[PDB]
């Protein structure tokens, strides 16, 4: 009857929308010098799980929020029964190649590979990860604690193709595990522009810097 | 008698065909879905006090209902349900919110679909999650908690419920290193600052201690 | 050289006729199946008394029979059986009920199909399961048990049977850290109050101790 | 110049096409048996665990066989005598360690060399954990361990095995390994079991080793 | 300038289409169509040295470069595109392997490559590698020395030649706070002939001298 149809319709609209987007001019070839893209990064640090002073590797668990905007993902909500956003497999759309620059093990993914696309063409994608990176935990057992840092950025695109930005320099600590072995003294996330004599193009990274110590 | 079997097979293959490779984009605000969760806690395998991670093995029972998976048993030679690869159908993205390692899957990825459109899927998992086992060697024991919920859908798209707050303990390993004092599973609604959309999770809370002498 | 090209053609035709033409959806209440299980225990590799997990390595022999896999050897140049990738045919979802890590596969995923419709498939596996090794260092030794059965089919869909209650120990590693006192494999039938179907498993029970 | 390269490319792609289509090999049979030649090049005994009695080896396993269905006349394909191809593109034998304790790990690309006469050569580098008591490793006499390699599903009526030599190649053994090799042999064995009327073949790899001084 | 962007996208998708179809799949190099791969290492960190198994763990970037005629295009025909990024699975890549690894290589970076209009490809996987190495002496002033050959697994030097732009491993990204400090790191092209075989074999030999940080 009445209510069952309205659900069948909204389903048809969504499937039509997804079809119109993923087939009509197929998956986007990535950014270029002529069509650059800005990716916004933010970290929500959940836990420093482990600090290994025999190999100088530290393990973090965090959510990496990524946001970007494509014209080719735009639609008029009016043409698709008032749909303003949708969930889709990350495999269905282009995603940026943001990588830790000093990891020592492949990143492990803790959350579904699904993204949210909005009618204005913005995508949001928020992978939870466990990362092992190069870090000397020396001083972790003192009042001053240890300090570690890891750069995140595109692996293959320069700043002429992908720019990075953060909404804030403060890493979100409001979900930090209250009973972690390590307590967080501060955690910052900072856009850096790197330059190199050989090369006209700039390189961009977000520098994640964590100061931590053993819980008392 | 060999024919009756060939027929029931044909009906099942036709049904599966009519459902999958002829006819789901997931739930929406306009077409929301309710997932029922239940845990059967098999074993606390390991409690690592140097990293504060605990390892659990459990069965996660998931249940939901799709109109698009309905059929009339009469049209398909009285078939009322069938077994199918979980890869063949949409499944919910229920995730542990505080895991520290990817979940490991211990059982086949197979689901049961019923003529009324309900699906049941029951993955066995091993999970490492954030937990301070301090006190696990005392009479009071330790307490740990982990939220499970959709990763990408708010409570306008996916609602969660439990049939019961008591975690099923009747398959708990009698000789585990740890004994279970209590295990509850509770639907929580977090509201927020800004936002109008409520978020739903199921909070798994386990009280446990070292098994005695 | 022709004799060989012919027998090849016949085999490829047979496989074609069976797989790419005529479609097995698994067993049902109306078309139930019997799987025969047997274990050959190769080694107890490791017993961890800090987590109560034991690691076994064994061969799990699985056998079943499908009408849809039958052929007349006469129509296919006297072929009576063939080897095929396990990915090419339906296989049962036999699982350990108390494993603590995903099972690791030690052998090729290949099965043997016979003209009468029977399949035999014998994965070698390493399994970690829930087990208290307490007493392993005593004359009496430890005892551990693990049920194996279908994960999603009740006994109305898949019955289980064993040819024998004795686990095959004739390939047990003579120099394992642990010696086997006994190892049995037993069909069990179970009801639960949720459901009206019988449920069926094969219970593998191993008694072992530290090698002297 | 540039054309003679485009041509040799076209010839190779045509050859590969002509082979992997036009009669797309079902494996050996009683009527069409096959001989696989095995050889090991032992690179390193990495680890010897006396608490679980497992030893880790790294070696190259050379495999060689010959299929009529892989033959071609070099004259018909611009004088191509051999080519490199993904192992996934052709049938390969199911040679397994009979007493491994972990899945084999593959250290090298899964690529094989096919020659106009129909012969294939495939040389996977592997790390293997297998059952072995390292007792005595720390004495002048050292330890001895053994592992059989053979087909998992084919009897000796379908696959015969042979070695070109009984001596395992030791010329790439890591000079600074924790363990030095006293001897390493590879031997064809023919077995009979009473389950069965057909013979079974393996190559038994026997290693005698001790701690480096 | 919404149209400009749609056009440059169309051009790129057309180019990628024209390349990955029409004469589909380059079949790899041959005696008649040999290829030169250029290797370079950027050593990031010696992570671990295990003296109980004689395995050392390295983390490095392996730069690989080669050139295919079949990847060439005229930038003029494709709206002035001079290069593009593509999934490494979309194109042939060389089978460069460590000859004395003890565990499968672990990949730390996206499997993406850069193709340029002149037909050259660049691909720079970050890896963690465990290889056979006796760290004896690491705790002395002289330190330890280890070596690992890298080369094609299945192609002789008649099919794949290797070369380096420089003998010096790039150390400018070496982790300042690694447990181990680098005394020197060289990367050297070697040519081998054998008795088994009239073909020449080429490998690049990575040699690292290192010791415990003080
Ligand atoms: C209670 O509402 C939520 C339910 C799930 C999640 C979040 C919620 O609120 C967001 C902000 C913060 O509370 C933490 C995680 C959130 C963003 C990341 N998602 C994927 C997980
Ligand atoms: C012995 O029969 C069963 C075989 C497998 C399973 C169950 C069985 O009985 C059910 C009730 C209880 O025994 C535990 C698990 C069950 C429900 C969860 N499934 C998915 C796993
Ligand atoms: C049922 O027990 C077995 C499980 C696996 C294998 C064999 C078994 O019995 C042996 C004799 C015969 O049955 C065939 C193969 C065997 C010998 C070769 N091995 C490697 C494969
Ligand atoms: C049979 O032993 C081998 C196993 C693998 C390889 C080679 C062998 O012998 C060497 C010389 C020649 O035969 C060809 C390649 C070798 C050198 C290059 N390596 C990396 C591949």
Q: Give residue A94's Cα distance to chain centre.
A: 13
Question: Which residues of B touch chain C, with CB atoms under 8 Å apart?
Answer: 2, 4-5, 8-9, 12-13, 16, 42-43, 45-46, 55, 57, 79, 82-83, 104-108, 110-112, 124, 126, 173, 175-177
Place of tokens 């051009």: E11
* C78 → chain D, closest CA residue: D31
* E107 → chain A, closest CA residue: A106
Q: How far apart are CA A134 and CA A52, in angstroms?
A: 10
Q: Within 10 A of B81 (CB to CB), how many other CB atoms are there?
A: 16
Q: How far apart are CA B12 and CA C157, in angstroms?
A: 14
Q: With contacts defined as CB-CB under 8 Å, which chain C residues touch B126? A: 100-101
To test the pocket of ligand 2, the residue of B58, B59, B112, B163 to mutate (highest count of ligand atoms within 8 Å of its CB) is B59
Q: Give residue B33's Cα distance to chain centre.
A: 15
Residues 6+ apart with CB under 8 A from A160: A33, A36, A201, A202
A76 close to A48: Cβ distance less than 8 angstroms: no
Q: What is the DSSP letter of B97?
A: T
Q: What are phi and psi of E2, to 5 degrees?
A: -85, -35
- What spatial distance separates the first Cα and last Cα of chain B, rounded to whole Å? 60
Q: What are phi and psi of A13, to 5 degrees?
A: -65, -45
How do B142-150 and E35-50 pair as beta strands? unpaired
Among A20, A179, A180, A212, most B C-beta atoms within 10 A, so best to mutate, is A179
- Answer positive or negative: Cα dihedral of E24, E29, E35, E38: positive
Q: How far apart are CA A45 and CA A189, in angstroms?
A: 11
Q: What are phi and psi of A7, to 5 degrees?
A: -80, -40
Q: How far apart are CA C129 and CA C151, in angstroms?
A: 16
Q: How far apart are CA E152 and CA E161, in angstroms?
A: 9
Among E22, E127, E154, E157, most D C-beta atoms within 10 A, so best to mutate, is E154
What does E12-74 look like in DSSP terms, one character per residue? Answer: HHHHHHHHHSSS-S----BTTB-EEEEEEEEEEEEEEEETTTTEEEEEEEEEEEEE-GGG---
Ligand 3 centroid – CA C37 distance (Å): 15
Q: What are phi and psi of E171, to 5 degrees?
A: -110, 5
Q: How far apart are CA D184 and CA C61, in angstroms?
A: 33
Region of residue A112 (left: phi > 0; alpha: psi -120 to 50; beta: else) = beta
Q: Is the CB of A87 under 6 A from ligand 1?
A: no
Q: From residue C156, how far is each of A200, C159, E101, E185 by CA, in Å?
A: 72, 7, 51, 67
Which atom of ligand 2 is nearest to C194's Cα? 11
Q: For each of the domains in chain B, give its residue range(s) and CATH number, in order of start.
A: 1-213 (2.70.170.10)
Rounded to a whole number of angstroms, the CA Rg of chain B reads: 20
Subunit contact A10:B30, Cβ cutoff 8 A: yes
Q: Give the start-end residues of each E strand in chain B.
A: 33-48, 53-65, 81-85, 94-96, 104-105, 110-114, 118-121, 124-130, 142-150, 158-161, 178-190, 199-210
- What spatial distance separates the first Cα and last Cα of chain C, rounded to whole Å? 58
Q: How far apart are CA C205 and CA C193, in angstroms?
A: 26
Residues 6+ apart with CB under 8 A from B114: B80, B81, B120
Q: With contacts defined as CB-CB under 8 Å, which chain B residues touch C70? A: none
Q: Name the token pair of D194.
A: 């009473």
**Number of residues written out for chain E:** 214
Distance from CA of C86 to the nearest CA of D (A): 12
Q: Is the CB of C79 under 6 A from ligand 3?
A: no
CA atoms in the 13 A half-sphere facing the CB of C11? 24
D67 close to D117: Cβ distance less than 8 angstroms: no
- 3-class DSSP state of E116: strand
Query: Residues of E annotated in the binding site for Mn(2+), as ranges?
Result: 7
- Answer positive or negative: Cα dihedral of B82, B84, B89, B93: positive
HEC sequence for chain D? CCHHHHHHHHHHHHHHHHHHCCCCCCCCCCCCCEEEEEEEEEEEEEEEECCCCEEEEEEEEEEEEECHHHCCCHHHHCCCCEEEEEHHHCCCCCEEECCECCCCEECCCCEEEEECCCEEEECCEEEEEEECCCCCCCCCCCEEEEEEEEECCCCCCCEEEECCCCECECCCCCCCCCEEEEEEEEEEEEECCCCCCCCEEEEEEEEEEEECC
Residues 6+ apart with CB under 8 A from E71: E19, E91, E115, E119, E120, E121
Subunit contact D44:E102, Cβ cutoff 8 A: yes
CA atoms in the 13 A half-sphere facing the CB of A30? 20
Protein residue closest via CA to atom 2 of ligand 2: C199
E178 close to E208: Cβ distance less than 8 angstroms: no
- 3-class DSSP state of A152: strand
Rounded to a whole number of angstroms, the CA Rg of chain E reads: 20
The experimental resolution of this structure, in angstroms, equals 2.9
Protein residue closest via CA to atom 4 of ligand 1: B199
Q: Do chains C and B touch (3 or more CB pairs under 8 A)?
A: yes
* Sheet containing strand A199-214, strands side by side: A98-100, A146-154, A199-214, A182-196
Q: With contacts defined as CB-CB under 8 Å, which chain A residues touch B147? A: none
- 3-class DSSP state of A154: strand
Neighbours of chain E (3+ CB pairs under 8 A): A, D
Nearest to E132 by CA among E206, E200, E77, E25: E206
Pocket-forming residues, ligand 2, beta carbon under 6 Å: B 59, 122, 171; C 149, 151, 190, 192, 199, 201
Q: Give residue B138's Cα distance to chain centre.
A: 32
Count of helices and strands (H, E) across chain A = 1, 12
Residues 6+ apart with CB under 8 A from D156: D190, D198, D199, D200, D201
- By Cβ distance, the residue of A57, A97, A136 closest to E47 is A57
- 3-class DSSP state of B8: helix
Question: Which residues of E touch chain A, with CB atoms under 8 Å apart?
Answer: 2, 4-6, 8-10, 12-13, 16, 44-45, 47-48, 59, 81, 84-85, 106-110, 112-114, 124, 126, 128, 175, 177-179
* A179 → chain B, closest CA residue: B132
Ligand closest in space to the Cα of C42: 3
- By Cβ distance, the residue of A25, A28, A134 closest to E45 is A134
Q: What is the DSSP letter of C32?
A: -
Nearest to D133 by CA among D43, D34, D207: D207
Subunit contact B5:C30, Cβ cutoff 8 A: yes
Q: From residue E182, how far is each of C155, D56, E16, E197 by CA, in Å?
A: 65, 30, 42, 37
* B127 → chain A, closest CA residue: A110
A126 close to A68: Cβ distance less than 8 angstroms: no
Q: Within 10 A of E113 (CB to CB), how many other CB atoms are there?
A: 21
Q: Is the CB of A175 under 6 A from ligand 1?
A: yes
Rounded to a whole number of angstroms, the CA Rg of chain A reads: 21
Protein residue closest via CA to atom 15 of ligand 1: A175
Place of tokens 């016949």: C10
What does A81-140 look like in DSSP terms, one character per residue? Answer: TT--EEEEEGGGS----EEETTBSSPPEE-S--EEEEETTSEEEE--EEEEEEE---TTT
Q: How far apart are CA D188 and CA E48, in angstroms?
A: 40
- By Cβ distance, the residue of A4, A15, A115 closest to B67 is A4
Burial environment of residue D87 by CB neighbours within 10 A (0 to 12, 13 to 18, 19 or more) = middle
- Answer positive or negative: Cα dihedral of B65, B70, B73, B76: negative
Burial environment of residue B206 by CB neighbours within 10 A (0 to 12, 13 to 18, 19 or more) = buried
Does the annotation place A119 within a ligand binding site? no
Q: Within 10 A of B205 (CB to CB), how many other CB atoms are there?
A: 16
D84 close to D110: Cβ distance less than 8 angstroms: no
Q: Name the token pair of D122.
A: 């495939």
Ligand 4 centroid – CA D60 distance (Å): 9
Subunit contact C173:D29, Cβ cutoff 8 A: no
- By Cβ distance, the residue of D12, D109, D177 closest to E30 is D12
Protein residue closest via CA to atom 20 of ligand 4: E153
Place of tokens 């639960």: C192
Q: Write down the H helix ranges in chain B.
A: 2-20
Residues 6+ apart with CB under 8 A from A147: A209, A210, A211
Q: Name the token pair of D165.
A: 């030599």
Q: From residue E3, how far is each of A32, A72, E6, E7, E77 by CA, in Å?
A: 15, 11, 5, 6, 18
Q: Name the token pair of A34.
A: 């002529």
Q: Is the CB of C122 under 6 A from ligand 3?
A: yes
- By Cβ distance, the residue of A99, A105, A156 closest to E85 is A156
How do E160-163 and E35-50 pair as beta strands? parallel
Q: Do chains A and B touch (3 or more CB pairs under 8 A)?
A: yes
b/e code D159-197 from CB counts within 10 Å (16+ = b): bbbebeeeebbeeebbeebbbbbeebbbeeeeeeeeeee
Q: What is the DSSP letter of B141?
A: -
**Number of residues written out for chain C:** 212
Q: With contacts defined as CB-CB under 8 Å, which chain B residues touch C130? A: 42-43, 45, 57, 173, 175-176
- 3-class DSSP state of C201: strand
Does the annotation place B107 within a ligand binding site? no
Does the annotation place A97 within a ligand binding site? no
Q: Is the CB of C36 under 6 A from ligand 3?
A: no
Q: Name the token pair of B98.
A: 């505080």
Ligand closest in space to the Cα of D39: 4
Q: Is the CB of E154 under 6 A from ligand 4?
A: no
Q: How far apart are CA A177 and CA E192, in angstroms?
A: 56
Q: Give residue C86's Cα distance to chain centre.
A: 13
Neighbours of chain D (3+ CB pairs under 8 A): C, E
Ligand 4 centroid – CA D114 distance (Å): 16
Rounded to a whole number of angstroms, the CA Rg of chain C reads: 20
Q: What is the DSSP letter of C125?
A: E
Q: Name the token pair of A42.
A: 């933010």
Subunit contact A87:B151, Cβ cutoff 8 A: no
- C4: part of which helix (H) or strand (E)? helix C2-19
């Amino acid at each position: 009857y009445k209510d069952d149809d309205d659900k069948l319709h909204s389903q048809a609209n969504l499937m039509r929308l997804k079809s119109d987007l993923f087939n009509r001019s197929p998956m986007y070839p990535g950014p270029t010098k002529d069509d650059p893209l800005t990716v916004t990064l933010g970290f929500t640090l959940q836990d420093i799980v482990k600090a290994d002073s025999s190999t100088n590797e530290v393990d973090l668990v965090y959510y990496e929020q990524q946001r970007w905007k494509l014209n080719s993902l735009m639609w008029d909500p009016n043409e698709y029964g008032n749909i303003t956003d949708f969930r889709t497999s990350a495999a269905d759309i282009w995603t940026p190649d943001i990588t830790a620059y000093s990891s020592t093990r492949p990143v492990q993914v803790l959350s579904p590979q699904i993204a949210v696309v909005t009618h204005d063409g913005s995508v949001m994608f928020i992978p939870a990860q466990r990362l092992s990176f190069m870090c000397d935990p020396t001083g972790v057992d003192s009042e001053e604690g240890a300090t570690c840092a890891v750069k995140f950025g595109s692996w293959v695109y320069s700043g002429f193709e992908i720019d990075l930005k953060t909404d804030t320099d403060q890493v979100d600590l409001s979900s930090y595990y209250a009973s972690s072995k390590y307590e967080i003294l501060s955690a910052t996330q900072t856009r850096q522009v790197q330059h190199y004599s050989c090369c006209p193009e700039p390189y961009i990274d977000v520098n994640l810097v964590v100061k931590f110590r053993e819980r008392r």
